[PDB]
Structure 1
Amino acid sequence: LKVNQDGSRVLLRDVAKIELGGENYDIIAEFNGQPASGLGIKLATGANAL
């Protein structure tokens, strides 16, 4: 991100924590109290559910 007059280098690790995390943390799902995910599937109009 920056180079100082001292000659040191400012890296993205210095000013922030880089993580692999959900795009948004709004929804969290549990199955019988255990962490879980899932897909809620809504049928298309005029389609057979079976």
Structure 2
Amino acid sequence: STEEFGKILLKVNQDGSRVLLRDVAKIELGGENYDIIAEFNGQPASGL
């Protein structure tokens, strides 16, 4: 889950303060790549 990735611990600061992955990045499900986008009669689609 994005939640679990978000709370990945990158480091602990001098003062016990914590740096999680969600503090340096946006985390979300998204395509392996974003190069292909299809439409069926103008409406959003996928296909094989």
| Range into which the TM-score falls when normalised by the shorter chain | 0.7 to 0.9
Cα RMSD of the aligned pairs, angstroms, is: 0.5
Gaps of 5+ in 2: 1-9
Higher helix share: 2
Flag structure 1 segments of 5+ consecutive residues without an equivalent. 40-50
Higher strand share: 2
| TM-score normalized with structure 1 length | 0.75
Q: Taking every aligned residue pair, what percent have the same amino acid on both sides?
A: 100
TM-score normalised by the chain length of structure 2:
0.77
Between the two proteins, the alignment pairs up a number of residues equal to 39
| Structure with higher RCO (Cα < 8 A, 6+ apart) | 2
Which has the greater radius of gyration? Answer: 1
